[PDB]
Amino acid sequence: NFGAIL
């Protein structure tokens, strides 16, 4: 993961 996980 390099992004946003909500």
Model resolution, angstroms: 1.2
Tell me, rounded to whole angstroms, the distance of Cα 1 from its chain centroid: 5
- In Å, the largest CA–CA distance within the chain is 13
Question: Would you list the DSSP string of 1-6?
Answer: --S---
